[PDB]
Amino acid sequence: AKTVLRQYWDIPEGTECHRKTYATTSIGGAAGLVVSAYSVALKTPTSFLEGVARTGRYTFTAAAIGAIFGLTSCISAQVREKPDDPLNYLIGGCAGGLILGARTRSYGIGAAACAYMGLTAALVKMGQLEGWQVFAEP
Amino acid sequence: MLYIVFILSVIFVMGFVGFSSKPSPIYGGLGLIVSGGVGCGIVLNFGGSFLGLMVFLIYLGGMMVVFGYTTAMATEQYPEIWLSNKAVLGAFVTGLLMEFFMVYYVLKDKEVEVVFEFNGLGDWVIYDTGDSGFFSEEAMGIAALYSYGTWLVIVTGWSLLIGVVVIMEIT
């Protein structure tokens, strides 16, 4: 929902961050539920015992990406000066993609794409300025 | 007692649950007679006996063709009752909660809806049509016409020529 997304942009104006951490999990959880729904098309063996097992691995990890991203956004904000910056969210994007290599035992892949996930997370946070629009009308 | 169409609309959805919750084309076949036949009464109470009884003429006749493939082709293995299977009954028990729980909110005040529009009561407002016309009355009273829509007659005549030739090529 876009109404959930609108609540996210009002928080970084102040110093409060305890509401921001819960706001990120609602977006990250709902994004995981879409991927969890399309994984039903793969067909799970038996019923419920392995069916809910595939829903658990996707939704919990996707919510964990948002949960750390919400925390790291305010660790870089409270410690040291300066408000909202592209460099400030780049540190937040690094920790979010780091736990993908913690999901599967390979130490890389997700951690190898730490700069790849971090840059894309910064590009969305470039859109706070008036010089970026995702979907246009006039 | 004041409601005429609203009670019939409950029976209309009642037969429609036996489609999503698959009961085989015999128990699911019954739906087109039970909810279909009552569905004519929804049309009949509003007006126009022609278009109301037009549903009876095809959806019972065409169902006999469907019946010609219930005892044929595929389904002849087990009857598969909607009261026996655990996967089927689970869809019916959630299916009735989509209908019967909605009627619970209709009684006293306006009913809660997924759509933006409120349902309210509407007993006398259920008809929502004045007398107006008397001689050659009703919009449905002179419904079907070959005039004005002359282009519509040609293409309907074409589409009923195509099918006969086409099905011959398939078989």
Add this chain to the structure above:
Amino acid sequence: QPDVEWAEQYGGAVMYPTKETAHWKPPPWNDVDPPKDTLVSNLTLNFGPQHPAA
């Protein structure tokens, strides 16, 4: 120069191979073999013994 060993990689299978599933077979050249097999559809009748009016 390219040989038959390199050509076998571009043969009808999965382009990039692997994946969880490799049950698919290359398509037959001119549509499938008749699935003439399965289902006899022979209906048996006990018409006689007693009183069939015939």
Add this chain to the structure above:
Amino acid sequence: XXXXXXXXXXXXXXXXXXXXXXXXXXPRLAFVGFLGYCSGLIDNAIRRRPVLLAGLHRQLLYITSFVFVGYYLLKRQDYMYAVRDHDMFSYIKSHXXXXXXXXXXXXXXXXXXX
């Protein structure tokens, strides 16, 4: 414009606005004529026939058809660009307040070093 407002819907030619004068032996027409000649070269490659250029004399049909359709296609091009300009210039004169003129000014700008 995508939708018609002045011109009537469904028409092959302009007719209502015919006065524009079509191009005579244009540089654009020569390229379409070359494309008509190019189609008469590649057809002898598909249907295996001796010589691409010195082959059959059915090529004249390919040259004529591309020129004939192309001439009407170029006529639609010069018409639609003219209507686009006609609607644009009429919009400025009708409003007047939308357009503003500013000319001759000396203003400071930052100069780069090295």
Add this chain to the structure above:
Amino acid sequence: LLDLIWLEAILPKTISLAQMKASTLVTNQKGLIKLYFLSFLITILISMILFNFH
């Protein structure tokens, strides 16, 4: 290290990971009209609930 591995390492991030994402959209769903129509149930729910537009 650099000239043949690490400067080339930007490419599998756009090729090998792209092929990995490609295999999850080709080999997925072993035929069946059932499976494709199961996904169409969700698509409407995305536009109605997950998206604010109507």
Add this chain to the structure above:
Amino acid sequence: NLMLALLTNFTLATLLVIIAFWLPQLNVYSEKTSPYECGFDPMGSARLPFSMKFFLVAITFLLFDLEIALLLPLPWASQTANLNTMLTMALFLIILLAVSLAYEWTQKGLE
């Protein structure tokens, strides 16, 4: 009332079933059989497709029944509209139905 007329006939019909259901009772042995009519044990247990033979002729009915429903305006529509404009259109649907049946003559099917 149409509702009171239809229900009174339906309730009287189902009540006659109850009379024939509860009155005759004494014993119910393992005596009733699946096929009956001719006797012996059923060789064809439960259900089996059978099918075919009339598959083309049955399908054509579903196609033809829609046209007869579209022919139902004829006695009820021809009252206000012009007859000369209707004559060309009213016959047109009947002519094409004979054309479809003419294509049905060239190999009708197994039936």
Add this chain to the structure above:
Amino acid sequence: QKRLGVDLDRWMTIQSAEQPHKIPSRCHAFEKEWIECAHGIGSIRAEKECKIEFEDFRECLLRQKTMKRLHAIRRQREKLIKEGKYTPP
């Protein structure tokens, strides 16, 4: 239409046209206003000038503006039980 019909017409599509016999539409009074407002190109494309007449047209077919009004009258009559009751009919 991407391609329009010339000379020959196969219309009878829009509301409030030449009637089947003589019988007029139930919303014909509000149907006449919508054609009169949106006959010019700069009305529906602007969608601001004809906002008043479109809202009146919404009242005709849906009856939603009259539905909520009549709901309030029927609720208050049911709420007032054994205190203040009137029945002229």
Add this chain to the structure above:
Amino acid sequence: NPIIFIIILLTIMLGTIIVMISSHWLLVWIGFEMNMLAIIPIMMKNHNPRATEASTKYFLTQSTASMLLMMAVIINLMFSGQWTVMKLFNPMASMLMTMALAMKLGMAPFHFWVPEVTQGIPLSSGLILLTWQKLAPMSVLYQIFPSINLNLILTLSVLSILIGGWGGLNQTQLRKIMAYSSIAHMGWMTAVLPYNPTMTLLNLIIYIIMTSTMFTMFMANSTTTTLSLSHTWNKTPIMTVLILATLLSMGGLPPLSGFMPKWMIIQEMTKNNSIILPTFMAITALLNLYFYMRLTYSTTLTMFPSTNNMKMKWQFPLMKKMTFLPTMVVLSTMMLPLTPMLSV
């Protein structure tokens, strides 16, 4: 087969005419159903176990889609009243409208039927029908470009090129490659509909001509990459140059006519001030190029597909527009910049 096959083919042509020349919402519904009754007989023809699977799959994943279209037509009676093909008026009506058309054009969440249907057709002439059928629902979207929520049309543009650009990579079947090339090009079609409706018709003209040439190049029997590999080393050598030219144009490259779509789509999108969306359109367009690149290696490389059998007799195919259309598909760049105005 002899006489009625021409009539059946004519009813698809006549069916689209009902969609093209229309003012009533039920009239286009008839036009869509006119296609349903007329494609499926040509889908079968030879009657195959593969054809029976595809014909029912094409039926069920399109007839149910048109039924969703009729809901949006009925909401146009529920709201706004008038039966006119101009605007939907309701945002609730447009959601069921767009997703119905997405089953034919949008593709992004409705691509699933396409690869199975395209491979299921036994005839090379039957492959033209799928690329030509997409002309019908485009004329509908050309009429109802306002009122529709742009947030759920542009997702059917971005995601469709992603799945189109990935879905052809793991496919060796020649019909399947062309099935996902359809999805790849249909992604561009849904992007121009919010940003200037003109050129969107020309996008089809470029697409249809380019695809109609492609399947007519496969009149010499080819169903797989390895079967199309034996074309220059066994059969006609000069024929592969025109296959090379069409494949190099299918992917967006400047010296060919297939860059004229990429020209104006980005040009008109930037005029409405959008940078982040058309950047993603260009990078995903590279994934589309890869399928044609591997298929140009059947015309350029050696690959050793000689085989024991060698053809000596001259080939006599149908070839309807295999000479006039490839010339417009190859060298239309100089006689191209003024053509956007000529289409509409």
Add this chain to the structure above:
Amino acid sequence: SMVYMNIMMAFTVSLVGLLMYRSHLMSSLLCLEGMMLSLFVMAALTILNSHFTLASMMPIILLVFAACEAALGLSLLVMVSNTYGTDYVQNLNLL
């Protein structure tokens, strides 16, 4: 308004019915005529309440085309059983 909400709720159940497949292919062809039945009731009520007379011809045309697809799909069901044995959504070869 009030009566429309019940028949719209009947449409949503039949919508799921066309998207749900279990064993036999016969359920879809019932739901194809089922969804057309729900659209026909919706069309009948909308046209008659705000009288049209001219546009009351339109659902009669719709009812003709309601079984036009249904007759062709039911005839396609015949040829699948001839190639196989019994019509099954569970039994398919194409990828």
Add this chain to the structure above:
Amino acid sequence: XXXXXXXXXXXXXXXXXXXXXXXXXXXXXXXXXXXXXXXXXXXXXXXXXXXXXXXXXXXXXXXXXXXXXXXXXXXXXXXXXXXXXXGNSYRLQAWLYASRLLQYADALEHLLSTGQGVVLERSIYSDFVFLEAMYRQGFIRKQCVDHYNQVKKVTICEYLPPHVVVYVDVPVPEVQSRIQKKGNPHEMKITSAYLQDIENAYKGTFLPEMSEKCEVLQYSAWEAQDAEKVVEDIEYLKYDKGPWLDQNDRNLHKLRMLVQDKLEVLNYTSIPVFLPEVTVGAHQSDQVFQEFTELPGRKYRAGYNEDVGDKWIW
């Protein structure tokens, strides 16, 4: 454009004395070849037996192509002393199977347009008898036969009628002495087990051919050489429940189009599969395509040709 819509129609001007006769499975010795010439008393059209240069015998050129111009390494004399690894073995048979299919396509086209009786020497349906006889001894590997069965399932099923009348000649196991009496030295000194295996496989080839309700008449060695006896048998044998009897409008129209063009039928014969006895090498294929283009016969191909015909340029 289709011409069947006009005055021209299938099954017209045929039927009465128009059925095709074939002499198939003659063990090894050409005994069926001599009686096929005498079989032309009843039937109008008669075609020569298929060999290494049978597709090159017609096509377009008057003279037959020599060695390199046609199929690379394909000779009956070379296959007589067959050697494994880098040899003929299978690549002769794959070329032979396509050549029999090509002449059958011309024969069926000749039968449909103007109804005349066509007699063919050794059908496509008798090819597997010649393959499996060589398979019994150590000559052809098992993997090559699997390639052949894929071609077998595609090429046969496209054509609706096999053969109306089939002639099978079964001689004594002392046929090798009769083959040695022949003038050809290259054909002589063939394996005794290979000739015996062809006779054993012919018994399991005529039986499935007769089971499909196709007319088959057996002729003995003592009953051989008779012209009046063989001609009377063709008129006496009536077709009953056979696959040759089909639809005149629907079935015959599709078969006529597929047999008219040589490129349409031969396209299915070329399979996209790698085989050791197939000659895959592109470097040798490029030089072979260059020599075929330099040849005085075809050169530019299809009607018009320089320094060979040249009738019209305009």
